[PDB]
Subunit: 237 residues, 4 copies
């Protein structure tokens, strides 16, 4: 049903569905079994920053995740998104918890998309930047358990009043306007997404992760995509 391209910050190793034995960042092209992963030294309670970049000339989706004072983790995958996605897509953030949990807090999110045509000076562009989320964020489509406004942050999954993360939670936030990522006259199409997050768990084993994703405009959370499926995929195939 949905077409999903995502960059996951997977906190919990589900080795039975192909995760490596550690937190990792991965690039998912229509399956939760990442096409490429990289070890991520996830820091519980620390604010991290993820940068995702791509352009149609190189056809390489790359992501860099870093924590202050720490070395970054980066993952890249050669993929032509014109062959995977529709030309009009929606971009968003997704997160889930299952039996194990963590807060999936987003403190800021910026995205820039550019479609440059072969006509001189013809660039179409979309850019949004959120450094504060209000309770009435009308330009975001919140799905599942995602809420905004709490300390001006976006909480992708359920957090009880006392700051505790809840299990079996799934939430997604998508920018309201469709994003144009391909057009017949485009000579170069590119996008850049950056978001800072705070994954905090009272447990030694947080789960399940946050994912930046791009999908068909009408994408909705697949039934049963809590836990390991990151609110992105209906099954683990």
């Amino acid at each position: 049903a949905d077409t999903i391209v995502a960059v996951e910050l997977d906190t919990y190793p589900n080795t039975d569905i192909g995760d490596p034995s550690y937190p990792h960042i991965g690039i998912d092209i229509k399956s939760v079994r990442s096409k490429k992963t990289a070890k991520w030294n996830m820091q519980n309670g620390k604010v991290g920053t993820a940068h995702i970049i791509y352009n149609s000339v190189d056809k390489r989706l790359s992501a860099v995740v870093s924590y202050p004072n720490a070395d970054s983790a980066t993952v890249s995958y050669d993929v032509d998104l014109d062959n995977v996605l529709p030309e009009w897509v929606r971009v968003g953030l997704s997160a889930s918890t299952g039996l194990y949990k963590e807060t999936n807090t987003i403190l800021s999110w910026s995205f820039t998309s550019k479609l440059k045509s072969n006509s001189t000076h013809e660039t179409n562009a979309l850019h949004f930047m959120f450094n504060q989320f209000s309770k009435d964020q009308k330009d975001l489509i919140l799905q599942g358990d995602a809420t905004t406004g709490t300390d001006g942050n976006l909480e992708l999954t359920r957090v009880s009043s006392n700051g505790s993360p809840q299990g079996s939670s799934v939430g997604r936030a998508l920018f309201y306007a469709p994003v144009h990522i391909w057009e017949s006259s485009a000579v170069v199409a590119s996008f850049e997404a950056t978001f800072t997050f705070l994954i905090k768990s009272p447990d030694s084993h947080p789960a399940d992760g946050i994912a930046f994703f791009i999908s068909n405009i009408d994408s909705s959370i697949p039934s049963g995509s809590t836990g390991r499926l990151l609110g992105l995929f209906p099954d683990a195939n």
Copy 2:
């Protein structure tokens, strides 16, 4: 019903509803009878550029319209938009023709909105730029007779196959995402809009004009707003 704040490029003088006896640019705050106008030496068949700027500290909405090789026309009006508009609005372009006509072609449109909060480094921003419009422009809400794709332009009003403008036409195009123009913690809110247009008429008297407007998110063309009402207002009060 709708709350409209608009900057009009009025090509036809309807002196009975307060227009001056010449093409003029004006600032309309909830009425077609401009609060302030300035003579506009409209050039039939030439591509013009309109720049609209505003910020919540100065509370002055200003517009500058120019043609290559010609002197600009500028109009400014002191108005606090927080007292007029809702905090979530939609921005768009509107145009009409009545008994007299003209093409109301938009060749490019860019808009930048910024809400800076009192938290260090906390700027929320939205920016879109269209230098080419495709037939399937999913991020625009087209109302009335407005169409996109024709020579990669946005035609706000009806143009027949042979390039002739049609009379009694009204069309509007609004950016799909709501725009946040005020928030309790904002120290400065500002927006900038620029659009290039081509008004061409086979007649000595073109009508009726193009208007950049900001309105409540669910705004729709008022019944009978063709001609002098610019597809913006239901009557001439």
Copy 3:
């Protein structure tokens, strides 16, 4: 000699040269005696943010200074900068200490200047953003006691090893490239500057302040401009 237009964050009231009896923000047009001031509830040890905006259509230079969780202070002054400054200027930050002192630390600085011409799609722009300063910042001209790199910050005035601010210090940092703020064909010229600062003093009376300024490209610190003259003016006239 130098032509200076500055927005000062004056921490010390020198009532004999016209300062009000409190910390204030003011707009200085070629004199340290501000043309307009506003009370500033300066917060020692807290990071503040100053926003300065101006455009040639309105001819109003406005500044907003805020601290997290506190109400902002704003000052505006109607001034046509084309009548004061050359068309090519340098922009910078200046600060001083005299008998009383404070640290004049800059944590980030961004500036955007735009000159839009009457030719369709003809915008000239310059934008720089510094959120981290390195020891070898080659695109900044550091004058006086200003240094960069220390905790990735820009220290406008002398701070000894143990973090103590030094008295009788003056330092300025200017962006290396000249900025074009006027041109014969420009229909609208505008600039926006934002910088976050940390003024900390061990004393109950910090002095003297930080100022965002615009000057002739070859501007240098006037002899004896420590203390009340903010490293900007040669005397108090």
Copy 4:
């Protein structure tokens, strides 16, 4: 002496120094003998647009050159610029003519450089856009025969009063501020450059080409770099 990384739009095939037998675009890393080339169907008298992109995660310098209504030509090369260039560089445009000639007119030039650090929200950026060049362009360093102001364009090489291109001409224009392309704490460094050009020759064989280049900050035209050496290299090694 100088370290040059350039993307050339070579109009004249000098097969003896390795050029293919046609106009081509190539990526030059410290030698005029391109590391990679692509056939370019150069259109005499037409305005073209070149887009150059690069980021430190992928380490791929790519360029796309297009003409309205024509298919683009693109060339990419895997190169880690941190291993070639200094961390502070100057970016510019260069052009030459030899026995054969052409006008090397630049109508617009924009460049964006970004250095994102591992500290949350820490992006340093530089962006400039020139859509009109004036006679007194103080933020450009013009070398050789390059001049600005003529029809608001930048003429890299000599053009006589009657619009005729002159032979044995070499000119370069560099942005005044140094550009920071690497820093120890940077997690991702990227740049994007776009420029539109008009190469027009009265002859069937125009020469020699235009090149976008990045070099050590103090770069100057090598002696004898007219013609095939593009005002970039001292010899053909």
